[PDB]
């Protein structure tokens, strides 16, 4: 039942911009998310001091996906343990406690990819978090699907648009509610030529180039969030990427880089069945 939103697909209602995504299959400069638009959106919350740590996504009733750098990043002296954080699911407002809507879960264990490269280019920027108890699904809490080889091959193409969501900075400035933006996947050569950082096959970049006019990008605080696409084949939402890194936010000539979820699916599956 993954990728089918209770307030949209399940009731045959479309959100205001999903059409833009479909037409392409041939947070800075975003907008307020609609209620129940990204039911898999998760907020990584730091216990003390209470503050936004990163975004994340719900992939089952007991597993949450995020970017490895959100939990481990030596350059900024970041090395969180499971007891240092909380997972807030089903949220819309950034700072308010959404009683009767959101659910706060504790972390049982954190799993960082063994070959995550924090010292150079954030290669394999991915991590899994097992919750102590399963969260109950609702209109505002629902898992997103993970892509299979065919899904990735068909939708991970230059020009095809995905959607990124998060409570991060609005400019390189904090939003009241969850922000959303649809961005086109950019061809590899362009991504590589826009930076001095080495790009790998475990990442893809997205965003508009200066000649396109439109803008948009993830920013600090959005890391760990999902880059999703709605399959035109089965009408389900798939998490194709994880907000990873970018030079600044929404700068002309630059692009946001996302962890290639399918490429690391092997690792994801291994961790899942090995640990419950």
């Amino acid at each position: 039942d993954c990728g089918l939103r209770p307030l949209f697909e399940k009731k045959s209602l479309e959100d205001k911009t999903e059409r833009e995504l479909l037409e392409s299959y041939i947070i800075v400069e975003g907008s307020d998310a609609e209620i129940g638009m990204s039911p898999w959106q998760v907020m990584l919350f730091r216990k003390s001091p209470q503050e936004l740590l990163c975004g994340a996504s719900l992939i089952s009733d007991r597993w949450v996906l995020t970017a490895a750098h959100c939990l481990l990043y030596p350059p900024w002296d970041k090395n969180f343990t499971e007891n240092d954080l909380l997972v807030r699911i089903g949220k819309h407002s950034r700072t308010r406690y959404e009683r009767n809507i959101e659910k706060i879960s504790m972390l049982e264990k954190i799993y960082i990819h063994p070959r995550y490269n924090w010292r150079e280019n954030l290669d394999r920027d991915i991590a899994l978090m097992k919750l102590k108890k399963p969260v109950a699904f609702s209109d505002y809490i629902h898992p997103v699907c993970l892509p299979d080889r065919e899904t990735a091959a068909s939708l991970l193409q230059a020009g095809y648009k995905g959607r990124v969501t998060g409570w991060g900075n609005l400019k390189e400035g904090q939003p009241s509610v969850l922000q959303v933006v649809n961005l086109p996947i950019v061809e590899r050569p362009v991504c590589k030529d826009s930076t001095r950082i080495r790009i790998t096959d475990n990442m893809f970049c997205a965003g508009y180039k200066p000649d396109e006019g439109k803008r948009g990008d993830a920013c600090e605080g959005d890391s760990g969030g999902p880059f999703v696409m709605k399959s035109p084949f089965n009408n389900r939402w798939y998490q194709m990427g994880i907000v990873s890194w970018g030079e600044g936010c929404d700068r002309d000539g630059k692009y946001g880089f996302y962890t290639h979820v399918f490429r690391l699916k092997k690792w994801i599956q291994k961790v899942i069945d090995q640990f419950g």
């Binding site: 936004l52 909380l86 406690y97």
Partner: peptide
């Protein structure tokens, strides 16, 4: 500037 969550969670 975050509200404050129920004590059970903390």
């Amino acid at each position: 500037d975050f509200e404050e969550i129920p004590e059970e969670y903390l």
